[PDB]
Scaffold this active site. Sequence first.
Site, PDB file in Angstrom:
ATOM      1  N   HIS A  32       0.900  -1.287   0.022  1.00 29.50           N
ATOM      2  CA  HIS A  32       0.150   0.077  -0.046  1.00 29.50           C
ATOM      3  C   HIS A  32       0.900   1.319   0.061  1.00 29.50           C
ATOM      4  O   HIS A  32       0.540   2.157  -0.693  1.00 29.50           O
ATOM      5  CB  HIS A  32      -0.932  -0.040   1.310  1.00 29.50           C
ATOM      6  N   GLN A  56     -18.390  -5.590  -1.035  1.00 32.26           N
ATOM      7  CA  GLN A  56     -17.513  -6.602  -2.163  1.00 32.26           C
ATOM      8  C   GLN A  56     -17.326  -7.884  -1.313  1.00 32.26           C
ATOM      9  O   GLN A  56     -16.558  -8.623  -1.954  1.00 32.26           O
ATOM     10  CB  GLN A  56     -16.362  -5.884  -2.362  1.00 32.26           C
ATOM     11  N   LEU A 180       2.561  -9.278  -1.809  1.00 33.76           N
ATOM     12  CA  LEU A 180       2.100  -8.830  -0.694  1.00 33.76           C
ATOM     13  C   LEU A 180       0.512  -8.602  -0.497  1.00 33.76           C
ATOM     14  O   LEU A 180      -0.151  -8.211  -1.636  1.00 33.76           O
ATOM     15  CB  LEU A 180       2.845  -7.523  -0.226  1.00 33.76           C
ATOM     16  N   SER A 182      -2.802  -8.167   2.486  1.00 33.44           N
ATOM     17  CA  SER A 182      -3.184  -8.066   3.829  1.00 33.44           C
ATOM     18  C   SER A 182      -3.804  -9.445   4.320  1.00 33.44           C
ATOM     19  O   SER A 182      -3.797  -9.801   5.474  1.00 33.44           O
ATOM     20  CB  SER A 182      -4.419  -6.950   4.228  1.00 33.44           C
TER      21      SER A 182
HETATM   22 CL   LIG Z   1      -6.593  -2.987  -0.083  1.00 33.94          CL
HETATM   23 CL   LIG Z   2     -12.192  -8.200  -1.182  1.00 30.85          CL
END
Ligand SMILES: [Cl-]
Ligand SMILES: [Cl-]
Lengths: 276, 276
Positions: A32, A56, A180, A182
């Site tokens: 990010h 989403q 990468l 999360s």
């Molecule tokens: Cl994100």
């Molecule tokens: Cl997502």
Amino acid sequence: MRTVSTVAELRAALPREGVGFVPTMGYLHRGHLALVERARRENPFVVVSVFVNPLQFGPGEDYHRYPRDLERDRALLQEAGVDLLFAPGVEEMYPEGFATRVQVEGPLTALWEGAVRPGHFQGVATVVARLFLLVQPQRAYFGEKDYQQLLVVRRMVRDLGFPVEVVGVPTVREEDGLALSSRNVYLSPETRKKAPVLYRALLAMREVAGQGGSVAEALRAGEEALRAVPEFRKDYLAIVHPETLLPLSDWVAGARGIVAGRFPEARLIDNLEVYP
Amino acid sequence: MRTVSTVAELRAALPREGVGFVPTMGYLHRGHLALVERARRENPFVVVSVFVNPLQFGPGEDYHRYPRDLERDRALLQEAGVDLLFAPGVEEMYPEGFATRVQVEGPLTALWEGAVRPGHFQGVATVVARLFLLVQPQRAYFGEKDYQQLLVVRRMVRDLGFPVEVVGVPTVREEDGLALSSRNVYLSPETRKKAPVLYRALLAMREVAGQGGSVAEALRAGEEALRAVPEFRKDYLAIVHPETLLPLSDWVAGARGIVAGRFPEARLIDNLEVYP
Ligand SMILES: [Cl-]
Ligand SMILES: [Cl-]
Ligand SMILES: [Cl-]
Ligand SMILES: [Cl-]
Ligand SMILES: [Cl-]
């Protein structure tokens, strides 16, 4: 850096010119920051949003399980040189009575991730459209890791006429190549060792393409790489057109290799330019 | 006044502030001019779009025969003091590849017009969203005659965050009460004489409401008025909440009488505030 969680404060804290925007779902990582730096260097004012968008996340997915650590994000952004952080609550983004949706239709959202996550791209398109309208950015940055999402946003922008330049930024990877994300935190120490298989498969295809192999031959090389790691349940593996995401009958500049699948505790996706 | 037919010419001619916008499907009449005068008085720069939007028409409707005469529209807007007229071709509004839609979900688009015209409001929401993004107006003007459409646009704007003030303008009528509409040109001389029945029915309901009658009594009065013209085939007649369009059991400020039906050569709609 000023942190805001309401639309009212957001609009008053925003200048009308030179805004660079980076939409994220929080729990920020090196990847990010690469987007934020790009935005910081190209625009006089930088805004980053942190919001886990429920729209989403579909049935059976990881909404409540999604990694969240606001203070960690706020400290990271503050240090990155961001001017404004927008961290709204679900009710601020979608108050009572909210009933509008934005959706990109056709093969672009029906194939690949769209087939595995029905309704996912409508949720993305809807929240991005709203964010673009609230922020009114000159430029918006997205990671190439989510290549299909990038194309979907570009299509929505081109179709509806948003006066926003959508910038795609190369994927940041670990030393072993794992892109990468999360969601990588989900991975156990053992699965993390096998995770590099997606990138490995993609490289195998690019290699064949470089050696003069055919699209079919490249796919085979990629399939073999994945087969060596049965723990990884493949969703799809293909070489597609860079703009339409349609499977390629032959090579075209920008040919994109895409892959996705899942280990018991997490689903992973990756992509890479295989040609030229 | 200047006329442009491409998005490029449009964006280049638009100021950054003070834009009043009036979207239309052409073949303008006095009613459109009321919207234009309102915009001209409240804004320094006025933009009017003329575009018969295919997305809001059904297969069995009148897309192909819809009245078209750009020259007459230009002459009219010229005298009205309009600054910019945007008259794009279908290819300019929806180029090859266009695949995005915007839609307001729920009862607001499912009831009344939405039931008679499946997909109509998705078509309206989509073109209006695009026009708003291309024009970037401070204020947008719509006729109250298409009351449901006015509410749908307001909901989309509220939900997505369009920095646009949506102004509803009272309906312009002929001396006998018939609401002006481009489609009125379809009416034969004999039908035109019977067409004031919609307004008459609405007036009958307002009369009852003003005399202290119940909602049920008001509806009976409206139905009786319609029965005077058997050639008119009613789709619906109701007294609804001004914001939700749900039928009312008792009076509320802003209660809206709505009616719609078909003559052999044209479908007409109309509405009126019946309370207080
Ligand atoms: Cl994100
Ligand atoms: Cl997502
Ligand atoms: Cl119109
Ligand atoms: Cl229509
Ligand atoms: Cl139809």
